[model samples]
Target: MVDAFLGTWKLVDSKNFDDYMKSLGVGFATRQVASMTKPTTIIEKNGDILTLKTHSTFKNTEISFKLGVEFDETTADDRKVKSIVTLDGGKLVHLQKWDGQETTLVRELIDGKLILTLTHGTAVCTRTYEKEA
Candidate 1:
């Protein structure tokens, strides 16, 4: 279930995120702005749909989906891709594909912190979020 992901979360730290964006073909100016953004995440579920929203100073993004179903997504960096989210144990796994390129985003709750792992080819980034009280 996505129970552990429910609630408001704030970004606490990020690592190698610029490289991850670069791997996704993001441009220099966009990557620079994206690197400086510290986003807040809200996860909510209503009926059979789960919504994940990211609020940032630079840009905000949201996605809603049901498990095991695919949907179209326009990423924060402006990439139009097909996305699918699924639950694997306690982790929420997301797969995005566009133009013969693919990426993975895995969200896991550990020790009261949400750990987001983003992978594209050889580049990997980790972002940590703490739940709001």
Candidate 2:
């Protein structure tokens, strides 16, 4: 299970990522840029600690945390954002605190699909990822 969680995963495709950013209060111009960008995801797990790096030609972002611990997170572009990441039923879940509300994003692997869910302000966006060579 841990090995499967490691390694690099490319953003072969994404759905509703723009809406997910919009829900996070991102502006139109940023959303446009984000939508066109394909970020590569690199996840490293060492014991109970996990580190995630999202990188693209246009932007790069990283997050590191221990399991079950809550910490603040800032977006790649220095967006004033905060989030807490935890594991729920073997799935990695992120609770993002922005503005005055909390949005939840869950990442899990079912069968062979990498599923990512973003929930905020009555909107839920689901993005599926795939492994890269």
Candidate 3:
């Protein structure tokens, strides 16, 4: 169940994150600053709704939404879009549509680890997080 995704997670490793950011047209200065530190993500699920929070020493962000419902969202990189979340085979799948572009994001809980994979055009990145004690 998607309930397995409910937990506090600390980032372990991020692969190709900067390149993925580049695909989104993130400026060089911002991408450099963003990669300097690790981030913590908290995914809280209540019934059919979820609250996802990402924390960094430099900044923090949060998003709350109901499953299966599409809502306008502004991403951390300043991208604006309509986002929808769904559960598939115990994985949290997110579909983001904006400016005639579409991206797919996935979060899966496995063996006490949270695996987050994101796709931006031809660039894809995976970030791994472990459950916080």
Candidate 4:
């Protein structure tokens, strides 16, 4: 489980990168660039605290949070938002609040792949991550 949660992961492929960017309110040009870029994510765990750093040639994003703490999040592209991250059934859960609405995202390991699910505004987007050496 820890092996699946910790390591360097790269976006080898994605099914709906455009939809995921749309869910995040990213612009058309940004989404286009983001879709074609492969980002690397490094996750470091210290007890209950997790630090995640995602980087790419185009952008870099970092997030730090405790297992059950609520915190504010700003995307690397400058999207301002508030989020509460926790663990549920060994999966990382994220609840994002924005503009009087809420979105839920879940990160889980399935069949050796890291899966991320984003649900909001009646839309759900799923992204898969591959482990890197």
Candidate 5:
């Protein structure tokens, strides 16, 4: 199976992340700190439920849910959102809606690496991660 997606991953690089955070209305100071901090992403699955956690020196965030079930989420940047996660073509597609706005966070494993893409409005960001030993 595709259990390869379950692991601890460390951020290696990112592109257009600043634009993405700006589009989400994050404060300049918060965005600056976020941009400089490389976070570790931990994904775990139990039966049909999945938990995704982000760990960093600046902040930590966690979400646990079943597929297609919308739940309340408070983002690391303190955005209160309604979030849902669904599997699409072997990828974890996450959607968050708040205050008449929405964002997408997609996670997939490609070539032994974890790829995360974030989108808000017209801004899109890509973050690449490598699995830990």
Candidate 6:
């Protein structure tokens, strides 16, 4: 169910996150700090709408939209995009299009942990999160 993602999750570990940021053209200084900062995310549901909030020491961002509806977003990395989020099985997939580039974010919960995979070009990053009790 879409409800699988409805909870507050905190970053536990991230792999090759800096490379993912590099693929997004993030500056070295910002990427360094962002790579070190653990982020907390909360996913809330309202009818057919989902609100996602990511908080970190470096930056915070919030976005809300109906499932399958495209919406504008200013990512924490400062990229502007038209994003559409859809559910597949237990995965929440985010499709983002910006500056002639397309990226996909797959979020899934496994064994009480949230696993997020970000893909851009040939670069990918996997970040794991644990639910807050």
The global C-alpha lDDT for each of the candidates, from Candidate 1 onward, is 0.92, 0.77, 0.88, 0.80, 0.91, 0.92
lDDT tens string, model 3, 1-133?
7777887898898999898889888899888988877898988977777999999986788889999999888988788899999998888999999989988889997777889998988899999998886
C-alpha root-mean-square deviation, candidate 1 = 1.1
Tens digit of lDDT per residue, candidate 4, span 103-129?
Answer: 787889888888878787766777788
- Which of the numbered candidates is closest to the native, going by highest TM-score? 6
Residue lDDT tens for model 2, 42-92? 889878888998888778878898867777887654556677777678888
lDDT of 6 by residue, 1-133 (tens): 8887899999999998989889888999999899789999999999998999999999888999999999998887778899999988769999999988999999998997999999999999999999997
Predicted structure 5, TM vs. truth: 0.95
lDDT (tens digit, per residue) of candidate 1 on 80-122: 8999999987799999999989999999988989999999999
- Candidates by lDDT, descending order: 1, 6, 5, 3, 4, 2
Report the C-alpha lDDT of model 5 over 1-133, residue by residue, as the tens digit.
4477888999998999999989978889989998999999998999988998999999988899998999999887788899999888998899999988999999898899989999999999999999997
Between prediction 1 and prediction 2, the one with superior lDDT is 1
Candidate 6 positional error at 84, Å: 0.3
TM-scores, all candidates, are 0.94, 0.86, 0.93, 0.87, 0.95, 0.95
Q: Candidate 1's error at 106, in angstroms?
A: 0.3
Descending-TM-score candidate ranking: 6, 5, 1, 3, 4, 2
Candidate 2: deviation at residue 47, Å? 2.3
* Alpha-carbon runs more than 4 Å astray in model 4: 1-3
Give candidate 5's error at residue 34 in angstroms: 1.1
